[PDB]
Amino acid sequence: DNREIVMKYIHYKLSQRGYEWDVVHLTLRQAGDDFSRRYRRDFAEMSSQLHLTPFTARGRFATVVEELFRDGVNWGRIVAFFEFGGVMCVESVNREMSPLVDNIALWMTEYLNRHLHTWIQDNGGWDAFVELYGPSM
């Protein structure tokens, strides 16, 4: 379920750069591109800030992701969580490490169900988000 959300976002992002790979989705495609725009405004595509290697990616991913929610969670920070993962999958493919994509998605899925699931429920769940973001599309 939350893993499907991860799948469709990864698939979506990967498509967005011409790479194939085998409602909450639409809203989330929207917020991420929204984020995308804002991010590329002040900084350069984050692919440049990513230094990746097969056996260093999981830790890197973890480190960053924890620095994100280290002090709190808000939907903005979660769309960011999404953008981050997807950018890692696109970088992966581009750096000739396509296999990782499948791993990155698992990492995300786990992180979602393990460390964010509580905030989500406590804060209205996914429909809450689909309703907050509603007026931004």
Binding site: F43, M46, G76, A80
Partner: peptide, 26 residues
């Protein structure tokens, strides 16, 4: 700069922007 700080700033800016786009839509 730090990738995580970049993510937070934008992450927050986006939260603020939709809470506002939400206030408006009321």
């Amino acid at each position: 700069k730090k990738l995580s700080e970049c993510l937070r700033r934008i992450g927050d800016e986006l939260d603020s922007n939709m809470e506002l786009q939400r206030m408006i839509a009321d």
